[PDB]
Amino acid sequence: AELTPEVLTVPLNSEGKTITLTEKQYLEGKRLFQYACASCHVGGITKTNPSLDLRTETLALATPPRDNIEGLVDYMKNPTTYDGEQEIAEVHPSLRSADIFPKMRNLTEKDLVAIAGHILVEPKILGDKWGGGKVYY
Amino acid sequence: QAWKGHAVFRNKEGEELFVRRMPAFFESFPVILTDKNGVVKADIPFRRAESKYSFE
Amino acid sequence: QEINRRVQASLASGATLEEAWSAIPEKLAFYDYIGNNPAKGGLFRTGPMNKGDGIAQAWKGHAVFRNKEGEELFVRRMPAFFESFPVILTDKNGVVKADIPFRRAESKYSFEQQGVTVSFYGGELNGQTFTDPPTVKSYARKAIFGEIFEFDTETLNSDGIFRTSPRG
């Protein structure tokens, strides 16, 4: 198996449009994800709330849908609860709360795109391990 | 565990009958019932064919 | 494998399922039972095999598991390595269809959910079907050991823990 262009092709939006990430974008995505997110989302779960994971289907059923680049980038700008009802930037890292979550200050739009791509691609490689927790280690 | 109560025996005629107690000497002892004057009124027979005092 | 060969040869010759399984000698079924596996014992588990699982009295017959849709289900057998083993049922292709869950709150495969049933063919229970989840689970628990037997556990005050044979 190889990290092919096809593996790296993920939904851009909810309207059927895709983007093919480069190998360098995937590595940047891994790196930045480790830097800003993995402290809580190591392996795709959520340590401070294990009920919600980063599996693609789960992201698909979030409101608004997050199983795409646009959704995730927006989440990284303006995070909501799973139903969209309240905005949670104050207790969750975001550009909007880059003041209280200082690791978010140097993150650029390109970085957010890379992170989103890691989140969507990783389950395509790792399967059930992603968001699986210890059961699947 | 608990006391069952005092057993009082009666025949069909209603006379109170009293079980003859086992003396310490006897590992086994027959079952004999007498009236208050010690007259034999009932028992558990060994031979039945000529039993006259059976509980029945 | 040999039991299945004989049963298949029986069905092929026109026998009913019940007839096919009743023709299986009890001795052969008894060899297909882990309690007779010499690798299940314990160093300080002393005495005859009978002191453990008991004096075998009779084959109960072959337990066949089925779900609410009527698909035949198969209990995963306990390998000798495991002193204890979970209860897992799969379809003929090995896809999981039922189990005895540990945590229940997120169970999706309980026998109750899947309406798992058991019918017996051959042995003492030939022709009988049980649908109440407690009983079906019990037979599944015994089915991990393979063919299921009736034991006298009273005669020797058998303690229920497998012992090895003279071979071991």
Place this chain on the structure above:
Amino acid sequence: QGMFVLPFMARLGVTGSWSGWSITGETGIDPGFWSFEGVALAHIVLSGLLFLAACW
């Protein structure tokens, strides 16, 4: 219950256990040190000391 020395301890006034019961059927009594356990322990310790003196 086949108790043999227990009646001798009781006989002279040792009636309670550190565990809280008494042979007279009382609960929540504090017998002090001289419970059945305490008597047993004292005898054990005495036994050991006598062993050492014997050695001497």
Place this chain on the structure above:
Amino acid sequence: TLTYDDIVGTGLANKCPTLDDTARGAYPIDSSQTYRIARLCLQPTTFLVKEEPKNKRQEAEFVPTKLVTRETTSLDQIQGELKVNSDGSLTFVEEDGIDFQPVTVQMAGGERIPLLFTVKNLVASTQPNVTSITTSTDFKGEFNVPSYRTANFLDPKGRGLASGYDSAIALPQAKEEELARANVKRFSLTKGQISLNVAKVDGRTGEIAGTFESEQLSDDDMGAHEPHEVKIQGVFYASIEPA
């Protein structure tokens, strides 16, 4: 006014607040006003367990026990509605708080009796026409006693109710019937009863204090054995407020 550092490790944190002897006043109840208890506290001082009857089948007595789980016993920060009823009686409806404590007491002979000391879902009512809470007011009611262990609890061989094995796996081929009471865990839910006897009232602040006595079942270890009957005695405190 005492701080955490003044209280920590002294034992005082397990004590309910007290009122001094001059507090024999009366707290007026306006039957048009809605009321709450802002804090109800219960501090047990004695635990009594009913000895199991020898077989004489006379009156089995409640006997003293020794607390072994230390000062971890009080119920506190409990709050709820205090309804004024049409007959002028008051009913406390427990809503929430730290309304339970696991407690192990030890009987003469060593037997340990775990229990869930609780006033969960308490509903307690006064006598009618209580136009004021006075040192003559009493509250009586019942509460829920859920299983001492909740459904996830696993016994030492891994058997449980909502989780765990459903058999004695160390005895793979023992006959199940004799072990059924142990293999099959059950979740108890029974009723308890409590009396609150007001002994002190500060009419101005809304604080009342007194003694309580409650009766409830102890732990049945998820159905493996019969529970014991327990009577709990201690002091209590409540602050009444308009709300």
Place this chain on the structure above:
Amino acid sequence: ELVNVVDEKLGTAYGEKIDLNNTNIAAFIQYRGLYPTLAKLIVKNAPYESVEDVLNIPGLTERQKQILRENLEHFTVTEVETALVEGGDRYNNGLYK
């Protein structure tokens, strides 16, 4: 005759759908729009005599009522099982990942 009540409950609709009277709250993540807001209101306002009764929760928005209506096909009710709802287990049932 002794019964494991959770296992027994799994053979009811509890084992097939989200039981508004018993199911742990994390189960509402399965379907769009239910978690955490509606989930919280639903658990808070249990038990319910019928599934549809969930629509009568006070304070609901029209949007919320509509979501509930779209997801009723996914709800059920069975008798409250004490073992599942005591201890606050409906909010946290000791299960994480």
